[PDB]
Amino acid sequence: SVTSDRTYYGYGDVSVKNEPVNVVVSPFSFPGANASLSSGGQGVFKKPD
Amino acid sequence: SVTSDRTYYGYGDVSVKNEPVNVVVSPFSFPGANASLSSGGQGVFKKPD
Numbered sequence: 001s002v003t004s005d006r007t008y009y010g011y012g013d014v015s016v017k018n019e020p021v022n023v024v025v026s027p028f029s030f031p032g033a034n035a036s037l038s039s040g041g042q043g044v045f046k047k048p049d
Numbered sequence: 050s051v052t053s054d055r056t057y058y059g060y061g062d063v064s065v066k067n068e069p070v071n072v073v074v075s076p077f078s079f080p081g082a083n084a085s086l087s088s089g090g091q092g093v094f095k096k097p098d
């Protein structure tokens with residue numbers, strides 16, 4: 001009578017949500033406060049973070 | 050008188066009910082919980098059962 005269609009199934013799901021990286025920024029204001037930059041001046045400025 | 054029609058019978062029956070196999074499935078959610086998948090990421094996921 002019944003000629004079974006021999007076909008069973010298995011399934012799965014994958015969730016890719018985020019991007020690998022977050023670039024958190026703290027911008028710099030290099031002449032800063034309690035220091036001074038002059039025209040034609042020479043030197044170095046550094047922000048560690 | 051009676052000319053016996055010499056024909057006796059034997060019979061039998063066979064019961065084919067089930068299909069050979071049962072594919073029980075536990076689907077996978079591969080990023081899972083307490084783990085994370087990122088875009089462009091590389092690695093391995095495994096489900097034992």
Ligand SMILES: [Ca+2]
Nearest residue numbers: 090091092093
């Ligand atoms: Ca990885």
